[PDB]
Amino acid sequence: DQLRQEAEQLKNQIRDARKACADATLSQITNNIDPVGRIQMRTRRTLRGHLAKIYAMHWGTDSRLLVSASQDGKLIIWDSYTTNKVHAIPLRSSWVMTCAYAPSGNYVACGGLDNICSIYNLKTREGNVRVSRELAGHTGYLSCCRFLDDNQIVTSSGDTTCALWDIETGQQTTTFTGHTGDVMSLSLAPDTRLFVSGACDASAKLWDVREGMCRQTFTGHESDINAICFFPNGNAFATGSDDATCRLFDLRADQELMTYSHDNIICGITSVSFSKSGRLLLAGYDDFNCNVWDALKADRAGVLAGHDNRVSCLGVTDDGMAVATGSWDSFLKIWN
Template sequence: MSATTIEAPFALVQTEELRKYSIASQTGHILRGEYEEWRKRTMDVTISEISGHIPPIPPKKYLTHHVTLTGHLNKVVDIKFSPDSKKLLSVCQDGFGIIWDVLSGLKLQAIPLVHRWALACSYSPSGKLVAVAGLENKCTMYNVNVDLDELLEENSDSIELSKRGQSTMSTQHQAYIGVLEFLSDREVITGSGDSLIRLWDVEKRCKIREYTEHSGDITSVLIAPQDLKTPWSFYSSGADGHVRLWDCRQPKCVHSFSVSVSDVNVVTQSPDGNSFVSGDDLGRCQLFDIRSLCPIESYVLQDQFEYKKEPSAFGILQPNSSLHVPPPPPSPGLTASNRRGNGYDISGVTSIAISKSGRIMYTCYADYSCICWDLFQKKIVERVGVGSVAHHDRVDLVRVSEDGQGLATASWDTTVKIWTC
């Protein structure tokens, strides 16, 4: 009898909690449906529709191969231009980071990494520090403000010199650090596989603030351009399908965007700061307007092509030759196993960069290298690096220099290529 007296109240409380949860869940679905209907009514036009009167970009190859940076012994995992656009930092899982002179293609510094398994790197706004992080769950700073004349006078090795001023922050992440960015010379942001983003004091090597609203791996972090007078703002994307806009002074995000049912691999901002582009694991890029807080255009590679329904002699569907824009061939060294059904199953977006004009979007696909999109008219302009100057393996990264004059692509073929307009 006593057992019934004890258990009955607990069962009643549990039933009441389930009832409240069910009501709250149903209310949430109704409100979300109403919000989606309202948003669709306000989305009266897309950017490609309203840009129909703008002259198209001439159909010619406007990118010229400038130099190939060779020296790594494994795939390049991250690249960053210096703030003055004269140098490029690349890190590789061969245990070294290299700083290159962009114009000549010469190596300026070789940095022996404390931990070999690097995943991300970043340049400080002053160009005096670089940060590297990866599978070791730590972030290491390197002083690269080196006088090369002093180096020659001392008759010492650049590798040893690069160890001066080296410091490692124990960032207390419980998983790998996949992304990092300098907010200033004194602050750095790290994003980890433990779904946490942390802001760190570089000098004191201590945590300033933690951001916890993502529910999956952090896949990218983007600092708002300094010239927009918002040095405290940054974006993040995650495996939870969301992009979030943060004010680094607050623990809660300013805006949250539900972007995809899959992982959002990358987010990048337009030069004017009024919009951003996300790329997900389904091969879709979406342009979001910050002022209206909604998507204004979507870019899907499959939509650009049509295919004959008759399979070829090799069992692979062939593109329709009557189309103005032929589909790009897969990257060298990769099979066609991802082609299914009546079209191509395009793999995920791995990197995005936007030109300084805000007109061109450079997008890396796992199996289709780097594709140039006209953001306004939703058309493919060209494919970066074809023919004799092409990469020989998957192209995973693309970056635009700070001055907008250069473009860098990094590949699994161990090289980085610099392109000019």
């Protein structure tokens, strides 16, 4: 009972300190920057071959190779330039919710409702793709696998916790706890030393991969957070929730900078991605179309559209040349 009072006063101290740092909103300082106009993006490629809903997609580090997981139980690696299928990996469980690509192109980790993160080796001497390691230890559905190196991966689950794994040994090196709801997404910072995870408790909190410490927590959303992605400089991140609102939080100021809500938007955000410059905030919505937000003025700088069903995944190449979108209509479209 006494500690409960201590908990409350600590929140008041944080809120007062957080409010005292606020001097001017982001939309008030950059009011003199000229708008970026209309970003009209045209479909350049249409990747077909999936026979079920597409739930995840990750870009290769060379901005040419893609990976996509679907309910059909197939894992396809695409040549994004010539639309050729490089690999086709049959999964054990057809219920895959996330699917990641290694930064070196050697491995692919891709898992889901089976509570297991399966890692596949592409550069094998036998010419086929084999299941190198199956990571187990999560009691809930898996989401947002992210490779750190060729032998280190961070995973998120519905156990209200995320885990840091060692692919060689197979043991859970570090476990990050503190969420009070299913964790739906995570993103790795460019300096590969920090990451943020968005959970169902309407809170995203910054975690340290080396120490396993919740350095900071961020609030403001009214519903569960569905997606997250860092600003390109690794000093801010953007979240997407079922509240049909996008928000930009700053790690140094510990306060949200601006909101990306529009009166015509009803359905929540599914995916969040940034451009190479950090100016266009692309977000996928449940009303079958993606919107491009000017991340500095909260102005809709065009709409992608085109898809027939809910857009479930977004992806921007490392060089920023193209944007890949996946939806439940079993089609991947590449925009530019």
